[PDB]
Design a protein around this ligand. Sequence first.
Ligand SMILES: [Mg+2]
Ligand SMILES: [Mg+2]
Length: 342
Amino acid sequence: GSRKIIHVDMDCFFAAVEMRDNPALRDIPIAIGGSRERRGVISTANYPARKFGVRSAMPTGMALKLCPHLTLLPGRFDAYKEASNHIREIFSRYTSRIEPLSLDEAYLDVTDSVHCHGSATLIAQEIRQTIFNELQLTASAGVAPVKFLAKIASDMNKPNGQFVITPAEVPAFLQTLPLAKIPGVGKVSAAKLEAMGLRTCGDVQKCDLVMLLKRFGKFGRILWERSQGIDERDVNSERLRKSVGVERTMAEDIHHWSECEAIIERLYPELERRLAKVKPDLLIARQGVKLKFDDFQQTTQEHVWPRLNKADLIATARKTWDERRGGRGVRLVGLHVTLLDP
DNA sequence: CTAGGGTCCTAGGACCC
DNA sequence: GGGTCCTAGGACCCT
Ligand SMILES: [Mg+2]
Ligand SMILES: [Mg+2]
């Protein structure tokens, strides 16, 4: 009863696309991200930039201190979406059991596959080769009996490689696995776990489930399970979008309601255009707004509402402005919609 | 020197039983 | 008191 899960993951995705489309960017340090003047961050970087320490989510000013010649690109999201659609269609040549997680990666359940004599190792390799043909981008892959190990495995031999974890290999792999490598255990959790002496899955195996449940709730059950290679989550090909949002961080903090309202007037057409692609009649379940202040606290207020409406978003933003700003400056304004259930 | 696109979980009061 | 909805906040995911 052992499944075969593939996780496929594009290498330096946004950057790989810009270098394919402009070969002049191949050997110099490049990064997709907002300028230092726009108070931006790095979305991703190529390997020449990463050598300097440039990483995703790094503030762009820090990226530039590490790497003064970093070439900064704004991003061509239709080009990334196009490559994304292409690799998903390549995935469909092998199975319909496809769960995309973002533009550039998916899980594949090839347990019941007929291709490559049932070899998941060879399927992953054929998919990676096919993506390099046809798109001229490289992908890495991970093969394992459950999702999270497959996703960990696709990181271990990148770029342009893969890694297979067999059931017999799972116990040795887990013993020294840092908890922070499990998808969904982030910096805050890893720090709480470290402070109680839990660094690796081997550390957590020596823990009582009941204690984990008390100290972490349902997360503690996930931790206990994952530390044993237990991950019964099925590959789900029927997930649907639940929200759509449009927000912007300004280059300077704003301090006047007129500035905030002016921001909303530019954001609203974008939100309407993106909703309409998926919901022509603009019918929704909730809509709402987001402010982030200069102390980086952020607040949202959203409410049941039947149909995208600009004035109500202005009105709600006005209240949030008056009622929870407390005289602080505002670095970000955002709009938001929750989509109807079906 | 701190983005923009999202998902999922938690938690208190409202409302319903 | 138990479901479920409503809303807010936050950890976390991707690039
Ligand atoms: Mg990637
Ligand atoms: Mg990815």
